[PDB]
């Protein structure tokens, strides 16, 4: 929330027709941008000039593929990057520049000396190649220190609409039997936004537990949640499910 993040991935051995490099652009918990090596253009997403973006990402595309060049050795390799910033409490922007190799963090960008750093040999290899790219590190520094907070602030202005979005969840509470002598109570929340939701169980007014619950997205950007709790058969009606969400004027109680 109040953060602009680009999720970058490049793979050395893409499957046929698949792109070697793709990026997702996120404004808080919402995706607004998408890009990939195949198309070569930055496209908008879910209800969200643009050139400054399709270019910035084209340069990034070159760098990620370039990283495979002097990593050498038979892959396959998966290079990931996290680039962005977030407005902090004091209206201060905090940048993010982390990199992963085959799922493991190994590189970062040091604002102090303005370069990518890390101890792994491969980080030393990639960092050195990137330093040799025309103005690459200057652009990195410039984006984390200036371009990012700026674009963030702009999207916040010209896009306050989708950020103030509020969708209360449709609740459902069902009881089903599991292991002998017990039933499992499942409390589900459907199609809500923002993503911050909270479920808790109560037992005849008493504070019960916060069951085992998953959480996930829906094709439209809204979310889904559910929480399960195991209770003794016949003790079901003694429970209530309480949900707290920004789209509700007050905590909603759900009975069987």
């Amino acid at each position: 929330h109040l953060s602009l993040l680009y999720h970058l991935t490049a793979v050395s051995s893409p499957a046929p027709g698949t792109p070697a490099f793709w990026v997702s652009g996120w404004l808080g918990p919402q995706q607004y941008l998408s890009y990939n090596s195949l198309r070569g253009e930055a496209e908008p997403c879910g209800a969200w000039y643009w050139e400054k973006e399709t270019t910035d990402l084209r340069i990034k595309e070159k760098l990620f593929l370039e990283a495979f060049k002097a990593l050498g050795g038979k892959g396959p390799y998966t290079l990931q990057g996290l680039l962005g910033c977030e407005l902090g409490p004091d209206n201060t922007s905090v940048p993010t520049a982390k990199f992963a190799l085959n799922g493991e963090e190994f590189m970062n960008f040091d604002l102090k000396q303005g370069t990518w750093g890390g101890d792994w040999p491969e980080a030393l290899a990639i960092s050195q190649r990137w330093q040799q790219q025309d103005k690459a590190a200057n652009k990195e520094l410039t984006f984390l220190l200036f371009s990012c907070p700026h674009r963030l602030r702009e999207h916040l202005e010209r896009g306050r609409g989708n950020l103030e979005w509020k969708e209360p969840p449709s609740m459902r509470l069902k009881a089903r039997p599991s292991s002998p002598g017990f039933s499992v109570l499942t409390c589900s929340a459907f199609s809500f936004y923002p993503p911050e939701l909270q479920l808790r169980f109560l037992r005849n007014g008493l504070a019960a537990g916060t069951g085992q619950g998953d959480f996930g997205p829906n094709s439209d950007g809204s979310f889904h949640a559910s929480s399960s709790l195991t209770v003794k058969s016949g003790d079901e009606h003694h429970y209530c499910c309480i949900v707290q969400h920004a789209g509700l004027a007050q905590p909603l109680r759900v009975e069987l």
Binding site: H7, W22, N218
Partner: protein, 99 residues
């Protein structure tokens, strides 16, 4: 490293027998990014399926959402089939109208 995928199946809206809904298969926590996902009609396949862009969470693991428009019947058992390098045989998870 390699991480075995986590699977969740649920509808967009609460299940209303006869009303147009949406079936979601949400795979996440896996690495590498190579994955194969399918939505099953009591054992069959849907040629009409869509998905979100492949993305990753803060721990670098990937996640993806597969969805199919639909209308719930009264006697079937929908499921999601996922194949990944970390699985001996494809994992099969069915949809429980409750979750």
């Amino acid at each position: 490293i390699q991480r075995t995928p986590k699977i969740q199946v649920y509808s967009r809206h609460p299940a209303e027998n006869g009303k147009s809904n949406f079936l979601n298969c949400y795979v996440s926590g896996f690495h590498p990014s190579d994955i194969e996902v399918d939505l099953l009609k009591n054992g069959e396949r849907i040629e009409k399926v869509e998905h979100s862009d492949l993305s990753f969470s803060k721990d670098w693991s990937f996640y993806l959402l597969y969805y199919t428009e639909f209308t719930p019947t009264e006697k079937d058992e929908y499921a999601c089939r996922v194949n990944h390098v970390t699985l001996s045989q494809p994992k099969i998870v069915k949809w429980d109208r409750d979750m």
